[PDB]
Design a protein around this ligand. Sequence first.
Ligand code: ZBR
Lengths: 245, 13
Amino acid sequence: IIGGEFTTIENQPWFAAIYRRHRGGSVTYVCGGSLISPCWVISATHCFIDYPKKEDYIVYLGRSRLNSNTQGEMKFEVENLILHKDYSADTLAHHNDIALLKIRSKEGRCAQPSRTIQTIALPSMYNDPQFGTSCEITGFGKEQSTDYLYPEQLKMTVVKLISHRECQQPHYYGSEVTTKMLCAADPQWKTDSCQGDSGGPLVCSLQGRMTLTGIVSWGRGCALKDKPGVYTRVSHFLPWIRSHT
Amino acid sequence: QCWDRGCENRKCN
Ligand SMILES: *Cc1cc(C*)cc(C*)c1
């Protein structure tokens, strides 16, 4: 996250931290995700497509820091890694960039709700906030494009949803943005998602309920003028989510 | 070009 503020997991209790174990024993951060039910984390397919082996992955809930144990955190393995069959990536745009991870502790249990571990509500079909609405993103991604390491502490920021018409302008993304995507950015281009934030939540306070409106997917650079973050539009994937579980 | 922020956990060849 470029700009914004540091945060703690009790403020983002649906946030899932996803890591990959390498041969030799080293573990590296991959992407964020969101807990949508006790056994299911939703993320982005591009995070896993090149290494689609479920045994590779470790998922934490209730974790505020990249390389430290948060009190109350829960560690999980991935019982099922479900990638979207029609995934593809153009120069910038990702398509069907959505993935499900069925999580299971070493004892075979799913998430246990607590102050620091909570599910986030899904939207109803095609029900999004209006453009101009402020929404939050959360992640461990880069704080500057020039960084080669991720921050140790979780971050969040607030961005505004941008209309399809605006995002399809020639100086924005033209026809590379589709109706299965949502654009969001800072009007002054000072805060944005970045590399490492993919798969994480775009959450909007929607008609009384904190709602998973988007999944961090793509964007040209980070916090660049006229180059919003682009998010998988969760309200257009509900049949896929419900069907795969 | 290497333009896309969403390039986590890639092989790159
Ligand atoms: C251009 C680019 C960027 C990343 C993060 C990874 C690859 C393979 C290429």
